[PDB]
Symmetry: D2
Subunit: 381 residues, 4 copies
C-alpha cells in the first residue's frame, strides 16, 4: 500500500456518526444488549468492544495504520517504548533461554535484559553491532536476538538480512527497535525480522508530548502478546494519546523528509569542520556505512552524533553549554533541536567521553550550522 | 491524616503561575540550562524533572495525594491496575521463590501469577480467603503473600492483621489489592501490609473513563519499584489522565459515602427477598462477615454480589436479561449501575453458576430495588 | 423527571459502539454519503451532523441533560457565561428598545448593557433587586427585563413570579442568570422566566477548569438563538470541555448538597460573630430574606458575603491577607474555598468597601470557621 | 520576521518547570498571595494571570506566535472564525455607520452584517471583489471596509493595496479574512489592512478538529477588542485547544508548501481538461489573476474551485456522487480531500449552479487527478 493511503485514508471509510476526525473513545467499558454477546466478549481473545485493557476503537484505528506502515499483519500501542520492548522480550523468553543482544541497544533495553538475567534463569550475550559477531554468539539455547539499527548513541548499522537469515534457519526469533528510522525510512519486517518495536514517543507522535510504544509483527505473535503480556501487565495507552498519535501521523512523511534534508546539511557541515573528529550519520553518502545503510533504508532521520577532539569532560561541557539554539534535553523526534553529550550519563563508556548526540528538527538547518560553528570556535584547537 | 486536607489542599500550596487547577504537563522532556544539572538528572534515581518515563509534575501531585490517603510514604501511578499488580509482584519475586495467592484474587492477577509460574521458577499456592489457610501455605521459600479483601466476585473478607503478623515474623512481604473499599474505607498499610495497590480505573477516578493503577508503600520499596520495574517496563500514565484522576479525587469522599448509603439499601432488599439465596456485602450490619469487616473498614462501596436459588445458567440469563436499569458491562466504580453474572465468564467455577455481581451507583437506590424486584418476579420459584 | 435520571441516564440509552462514556467528537466536520443528504444539511437549521459551528454529538448530550435539569425545552452550550448572557440579550433587543436591568447583576452583564447602549439605540434602566422597582421601570418600549437572583456580591433575592406575571401580561421577555443556585436549587423557568442562563464555569462544571455558558428556554427562542446569534457570533464550546462538563455533572447533586450543608455552618458562625456586621446568605433560616428565598429555592449554594465593621480598605486588606485556608481568587463553584473583598475591584461602590465574598467548598466547614475566626480576631474591635 | 523562528522558538525560552511542551493551563482562575496584586488584577486591562475570560499562559504563547507570523503587534485567539469576524466588526461599527463588504465574503460574515443591519442602524453595501467597486461604494459614513482575498467559493483576488490606500486617506478601517492563504502565503498587514482575521479551524490548526478564530492587529485596536468585545461577549478558546493549535502550528510551513505543490498539479489538470469550463486557483501561473495574486501572495493553498460546462444541478450531482476519493463535507485546511458543490447550498446564486469547490490535501495529487478524471468521464459532453 502507499504511505499516503495509510496515513490519510486506511481504516477511515466508516467512522461513527460520519465524523471525519475519529472520535476519542475515552471509556473503560462498553455495555451489552444481550447475555450471549457479553459471554462471547468474556470468552474470546479480542472482542470489539468490552474493556480498555483490551481493544479500543480509537487506539485500534491507529494500530491498523501503524501495522500497515511497517508491513506487519498486526500492531499494538502501549504506554511507552519500554513497554513495547519489555513485553516483546518477555513473549520470546522463558527460564533457561539465551539471548544475543547488541551492546549498543538503547540503555533501558539492556537494563531490562540485565534485570531478567539477575532475577530469572536468562543468559544474555552482549555483542558489537556486527552481524558476524551476532551470529557467532548464537548457542543451542538462544531463543532471541535483539537488534537496533542504527544503534543508540553511535548510530551504527547492522546487516539485518545476514542476521535474520541465520535466525530463520535456526527458528530463533528476532526483535528490532526501528525508532531511529521510523517506518518511513526502514521496514525491517521486509528484512526478515519477526517483531518490530518503536518508541512512538519519538518520530511517530512527533511532537514531544505523547509517550507511547508500538509492537508490530505477524498475527500469531501479536495475538499471544495481546492476550498474555498486554492483558497481564496492562501497559495501556490512553485513547486520548492514541488520537494525538493519529493527529501526529498525518505529517509523518512530511516531517521525516524534512529531517532527512536538514540532517544531510548538518552532517555535511560537521564532517568538514576541523574541530570534529568524526560524524555518525549513516545516511550521509560520505559515511563509511552508507552502502550498507542505503541497502536497508530509504533515508535517514534527524538524529546523529559526532565526536570532539578531546577526552576532557570539561571541554565537552564548555562546548554544549555554548550552544544557544540546540537545547540540552533527552528525547528526540520532534521539531525540537536537542543536544545531549553522552558523558552526562552515569554509565557513559570512557571511549564516549567525546561523543555528542544532536537531534536536527524541522527548521532552517543553517541556523543549526551557525550554532554549531560558533560553539566549535569557542573551544581550543 | 485528614481526608479533606488531602483531597483539597495537600501539595497545592505552590502551583506554576499561581494556577488553581494544576497545569497538565503533557511533555516528554524538560530542558536544562546547565550541563551539571543535566548530569545530575541522568545519574540520580528521580530528578525533578527530566523525562516522562520518570517523574511528571502533574502525576507527582496526584501520587503524593494518593500516598497520603493510604497513609503510605510514597506512591506511583501507572497505566492500569494490572500494571500496579504485576510490577509489585515482580518487585518481590525472583527465581526459586514461592508465593501464597488468595484464590479469589482478581482473575488477571491469578493469570499473571500463572504466567510467571509457567515461564520462570516461581511456585504459587492458591488458597481460600481465610487467614489460617493463607498462613498454613507459607513455606521456607515464600517471599510474597498476595491478598485482596473483600475478594473479587464473592466479596469475602480476610483477617488481614492475622496474615501480616505471621508475614512480618518471617520477613515475608505482603501486597494487597484495596480497589473494592478505596482508601476512604480501608487503609491496609495500617493493618501491616507492605504494598497497597489499586485499580484507579474503578473508584479513585470514579467516572468510567481513565484507566490507571496505583502502587503505594514505604520509601525503600517504592524507590526500587520506580527505578527498576517502572523505568524498565514503562507503564507510564498520561499526565492528561493523571489530571483527570485529580479532578475525580475531589469528589471521592462524597461518592464513597453515597455508594455506601445506596449499597445498604440494595443489600437489605436482597437479603430479605425470598428468591435470593444469599448476599455478599460485608459492610451490611446483618452480614456474617460484619464483625471482621467493620474491624478493618469504616464503610463499604457499591460493589456486591448475590446468588439466585438455582443451578441453571439459563435461569441466570433470564434474570439478567430482565433487568432494565442495571446495564450489562464489566468494570465498576462510577455512577454506572452495572451487572455481570459470573457464568458469563468462560472460567466461571461450577459453584458460581448462580452468582451475580452488581455495582450500585450514585442515584436513587429505590430505582435499583424496583429493577431487581421486577426481575426476580419473572423467574420461577426454585424446586423444593 | 427525577434529577438522578437526568444526571445518570437521560440521553445515554444508545451511545456509539456501545461505549458507556460518551465519546469525544473532537471534529470540525462530518462526511456525507449522498448529495441529497448534504443539501439537507446545508439548508436545514440544525442537521445532525454537519459542522462544529452547529450541533455536536458530545455537546448535544450535555445540552439535553441541562435543558431537562432546568425544565426547559432546549438548551445550548457556549464558550462562557458571558457568551450565554450576551447572546440572550442580543436575541431579545433591537434599535429603539428599552431594558430594565437589576443593578446588582454580574458586572460584565452590566458592562455589556452599557456597551450596547453606547454603540446602539438601546436604553437601559438599572434598578435595585426589588420586584416593585423593576415593574415600575417598565415603559412602553421595554422589551427585556434582566434578572439575577440571588444577585452578584450582595446575594439579594427578587420575587421572580411578581416580575414574570407583569412581564408575561405585557409580552416583555425575561432572562435570568441562575448561576448562584444551580439547577439543583432553583428552576426559574417554573417561576415564569423566558430564558435561563448559567456560567457553567462555576457549579455545573464544578471543578475550576472549564469555562462555559448555558442558554436554556423554549423551542422557539432557542431555535432562533441557535440559527442567528450562535451561528453568526460562533461562541462554540470545545467538545472536550463539553465532555468534561458531563463528567462534572455526575456529582452535581452530591456537590450542591454538600455546599449547602457547609454554607449553613459557615453562615451561622458569621451571623453570630461579634466582628461581623451582617451576612448575606438568603437560604440560612435566620436570614431576613429566607421566606422569599425558600419560596423559590430548595436550597442554597456555597457562595455568600458578609460585612466587616469598617469603612477602611486597609482593615479589609488586613483581614483577607490573614486568611490561611480561603485563597484570594475570583471565580467560584468548585471544591475551592475562595475569598475576594469587593474593594479589590476598581468599580466597587463606596458602600461595599466592607463587603467580603467567600465561597464555601466541599470539605470540613469547621476548618473554614476556624480560619475566619482567627482572622477576625486579628482586626481591632 | 523569520518563519521558522516563530514556529519553533519564539516565546518558548522560559517555560514553567523547564518543560519543552508548554503545559496546558486548563484553569478558570489563579490565586493571589497579596491583596495589592489582586487589586491590580481586578483594575488593570490585562493582568497575567487572573481569569480565563482574560489572558491564559497557554493561549497567550500561541497568540504571540500568531501575531508574529502576521507581522502584527498583537493577536487574540477566540472560539471560532466567526467570533474573530463578528467581534472585529463590532469593534469598528456603531449606530449610524456604513460598511462596504465584498459580496463573495464568507456566507456567515454576510449573514452577520445583515443581522446587524436588521437589528441596528448599520448600513451595508455589498460589492464585487474589485478594488474599484469597493472604493466607489465608500460614503461619508463608511467606517469599515470588509475584505477577503482570495474570496469564498470563487477564489477571486482583490487589489488590497488599492483599497487600503483609499481607506487610509479617509480614516476608514479595514478588516481582511486571510484564512485561504494562511500567514505563510499572505500577510495583509504589510498590504495596509488594519485587522487580520482567520478561521484557525482551517489551515492554522490544520487537522480538522479544533475550532478557533484569530484576530490580529495593532496594539491600540487589539487592546480595545480585548477589554471590550472579548471580555463582554466571552468567545474564549479552551487552553486545551490552544495547545492543539500550538501542536498543529509546528508543521504549518511544511503543510502549506505541500498543499501548494499538490494544488498546482490538480489545478493544471483541471485547466487542461475539455469538460472543465474554468478553474479558480489564483496562484497557478496560468491563472488570469496570477499577476495580481503573486504581487500579494508567496504561494497558494489547497482550496480551489472550478465549473462544469453545464447549467444542470443534476449533472453536478452526477459528477460529485461519482467521486471516490474526495469526500463530501464542508470545512477545509487539513489532510482531508473534500468536495462541496455550491448548488448544495440553499442560497447558491443561480450563476453558481455549475461551481464545485475542492480542497486538495497532503497526499499524492495524482490520486486526486485520477478521481476527478474518472468522474469527468461519466458525465455527458455539453450540448453545442
Amino acid at each position: 500500500m502507499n504511505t499516503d493511503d495509510i496515513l490519510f485514508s486506511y481504516g477511515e471509510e466508516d467512522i461513527p456518526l460520519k465524523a471525519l476526525s475519529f472520535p476519542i473513545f475515552e471509556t473503560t467499558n462498553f455495555y451489552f444488549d444481550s447475555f450471549d454477546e457479553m459471554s462471547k466478549a468474556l470468552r474470546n481473545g479480542d472482542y470489539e468492544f468490552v474493556y480498555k485493557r483490551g481493544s479500543n476503537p480509537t487506539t485500534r484505528l491507529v494500530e491498523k495504520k501503524l501495522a500497515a506502515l511497517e508491513e506487519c499483519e498486526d500492531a499494538r500501542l502501549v504506554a511507552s517504548g519500554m513497554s513495547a520492548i519489555s513485553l516483546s522480550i518477555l513473549h520470546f523468553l522463558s527460564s533457561g533461554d539465551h539471548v544475543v543482544c547488541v551492546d549498543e541497544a538503547y540503555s533501558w533495553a539492556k537494563k531490562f535484559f540485565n534485570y531478567l538475567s539477575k532475577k530469572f534463569d536468562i543468559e544474555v550475550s552482549y555483542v558489537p553491532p556486527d552481524a558476524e559477531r551476532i551470529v557467532e554468539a548464537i548457542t543451542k539455547k538462544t531463543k532471541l536476538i535483539y537488534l537496533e539499527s542504527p544503534t543508540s548513541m553511535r548510530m551504527k548499522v547492522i546487516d539485518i538480512r545476514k542476521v535474520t537469515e541465520a535466525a530463520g534457519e535456526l527458528k530463533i526469533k528476532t526483535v528490532i527497535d526501528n525508532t531511529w528510522a521510523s517506518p518511513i525510512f526502514q521496514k525491517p519486517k521486509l528484512l526478515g525480522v519477526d517483531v518490530v518495536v518503536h518508541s512512538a514517543t519519538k518520530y511517530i507522535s512527533g511532537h514531544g508530548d505523547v509517550m507511547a510504544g508500538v509492537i508490530a509483527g505477524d498475527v500469531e505473535d501479536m495475538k499471544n502478546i495481546f492476550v498474555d503480556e498486554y492483558k497481564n501487565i496492562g501497559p495501556v495507552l490512553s485513547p486520548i494519546e492514541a488520537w494525538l498519535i493519529l493527529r501526529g501521523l498525518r505529517t509523518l512523511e512530511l516531517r521525516m523528509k524534512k529531517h532527512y534534508e536538514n540532517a544531510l546539511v548538518v552532517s555535511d557541515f560537521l564532517m568538514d569542520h576541523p574541530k570534529v573528529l568524526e560524524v555518525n550519520y549513516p545516511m550521509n553518502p560520505r559515511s563509511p556505512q552508507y552502502e550498507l545503510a542505503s541497502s536497508q533504508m530509504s533515508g535517514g532521520s534527524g538524529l546523529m552524533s559526532f565526536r570532539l577532539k578531546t577526552d576532557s569532560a570539561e571541554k565537552v561541557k564548555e562546548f554544549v553549554e555554548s550552544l544557544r539554539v540546540f537545547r540540552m534535553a533527552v528525547s528526540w523526534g520532534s521539531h525540537e533541536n536537542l543536544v545531549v553529550p553522552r558523558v552526562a550519563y552515569g554509565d557513559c563508556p570512557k571511549k564516549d567521553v567525546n561523543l555528542i548526540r544532536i537531534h536536527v528538527g524541522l527548521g532552517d538547518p543553517e541556523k543549526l550550522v551557525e550554532d554549531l560553528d560558533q560553539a566549535l570556535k569557542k573551544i581550543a584547537a
